[PDB]
Amino acid sequence: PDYKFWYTQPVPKINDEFNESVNEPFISDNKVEDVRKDEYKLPPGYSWYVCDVKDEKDRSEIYTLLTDNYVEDDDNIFRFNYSAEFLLWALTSPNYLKTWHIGVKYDASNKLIGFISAIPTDICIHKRTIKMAEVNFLCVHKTLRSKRLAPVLIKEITRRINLENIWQAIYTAGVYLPKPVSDARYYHRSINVKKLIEIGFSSLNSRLTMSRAIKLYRVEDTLNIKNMRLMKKKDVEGVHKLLGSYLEQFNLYAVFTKEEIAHWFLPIENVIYTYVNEENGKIKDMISFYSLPSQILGNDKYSTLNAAYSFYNVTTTATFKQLMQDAILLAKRNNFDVFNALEVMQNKSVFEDLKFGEGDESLKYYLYNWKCASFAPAHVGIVLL
Ligand SMILES: C#CCCCCCCCCCCCC(=O)SCCNC(=O)CCNC(=O)[C@H](O)C(C)(C)COP(=O)(O)OP(=O)(O)OC[C@H]1O[C@@H](n2cnc3c(N)ncnc32)[C@H](O)[C@@H]1OP(=O)(O)O
Ligand SMILES: Cc1nn(C)c(C)c1CCOc1cc(F)ccc1-c1ccc2c(c1)c(CN(C)C)nn2C
Ligand SMILES: [Cl-]
């Protein structure tokens, strides 16, 4: 590929590799006063719109755009169906800016046809903590693809982020762009076997009949960690200590404040599930996963694949395998069809024994305006929604 847009940006070229001693911006000594104050030009008939995600109607417009036009798998069987409540949660983390929730409308219909978002977070990359924007939910309507709208959205959110004296960003994508700092395959653990077979997600054969498949993935409805329970507000301090200490081992992670722990982990039904094990009033283990359904395209019987996505999991009183087995059980108890996880943190070590299967694509991790050594995904300690 030519990367005609991306090679104008402060990112590595596709062949760039850096030693471990390199960990710095491509462009330093940036000045807020020099940042463009004018919005990037859109094609005629289109206008910028500042979305208010706390307004139900604006939020529902983003929801509809994404439901109809957001990420599909490689085979166009599934399309992500983030719920409106999920989008509210994902976009209103501590210190969020409404002006970083950027829509594009088609003037004649007043309809949203494009979106991009960012939230602020402190990111530790190779032991150096940098204030960054986390970019997500970039979407252009299917009818307007390949018209170079996405670089306009990217340049406009870059401009707005730079106005806040922030010069780095983290983002993930499935497409290969210049240039990943890490690449993580995803793995799936079947829960509702029959449904997964009926929609083509899973397969049978003459050895693995339907009944044998169901038996293979059967789970015992008893926790390894008996007192694992839904997180409560009182647990924020202990989760902050447990997770914050755990994450320091990785090459890439968010440095969460207590306010961020409360936001990202306190349970919201059909959005975010966090469970904790409290011993002596101290939090010693945690499980978390978020709800991300995929619409099943064209299916007559099922509209939705109800998937739970591994988020952050820490154990000090059990094995990581026992902890993730409990995560699968808790996902089953909450009526999820499948448990999805990336090969980040310690996850890959449990995939074989817990009967995960390898998926057909991977998620790449990227930094904007940062040069450093890349790393295997076991060194990644951050999950983007
Ligand atoms: C400091 C501060 C810095 C802040 C900025 C940091 C950088 C942020 C980059 C964006 C990160 C996005 C993270 C995500 O949210 S993940 C989910 C992506 N959401 C989807 O997968 C939904 C379905 N899909 C779509 O809605 C569209 O395909 C897209 C993704 C909007 C792309 O639009 P389309 O009409 O195809 O393409 P056009 O407008 O002609 O633009 C082509 C140029 O664009 C590049 N590109 C494509 N996909 C990208 C993508 N996902 N992220 C970034 N760049 C992407 C591509 O390479 C090319 O540029 P070149 O010529 O190669 O240099
Ligand atoms: C099921 C299913 N449904 N769909 C629609 C897909 C792609 C699958 C496969 C299953 O993907 C995953 C499974 C995991 F454990 C973890 C991550 C993904 C994943 C893959 C590609 C991704 C995204 C998320 C996102 C969303 N954040 C991260 C920006 N963007 N991209 C391009
Ligand atoms: Cl139990």
From TrEMBL:
Keywords: Acyltransferase, Transferase
Glycylpeptide N-tetradecanoyltransferase N-terminal domain mapped to chain residues: 29-182
Segments forming domain Glycylpeptide N-tetradecanoyltransferase C-terminal: 198-374
The protein's enzyme class: transferase
Pfam families registered for this protein in UniProt: NMT, NMT_C
Molecular-function GO terms, alphabetical: glycylpeptide N-tetradecanoyltransferase activity
One GO CC term, this protein: cytoplasm
Transport is among the record's keywords: no
Enzyme Commission number: 2.3.1.97
Catalytic activity: N-terminal glycyl-[protein] + tetradecanoyl-CoA = N-tetradecanoylglycyl-[protein] + CoA + H(+)
UniProt-listed PANTHER family: GLYCYLPEPTIDE N-TETRADECANOYLTRANSFERASE, N-MYRISTOYL TRANSFERASE
Family assignment from sequence similarity: Belongs to the NMT family.
Task performed by this protein: Adds a myristoyl group to the N-terminal glycine residue of certain cellular proteins. Myristoylates adenylate kinase AK2. During the asexual blood stage, may myristoylate proteins such as ARO, CDPK1 and GAP45. Probably by mediating protein myristoylation, plays a role in the assembly of the inner membrane complex during the early stages of schizogony and in the formation of rhoptries in the late stages and thus merozoite egress.
Assembly information from the UniProt record: Heterodimer composed of NMT and AK2; AK2 myristoylation stabilizes the complex.
Protein name in UniProt: Glycylpeptide N-tetradecanoyltransferase
Species for this entry: Plasmodium vivax
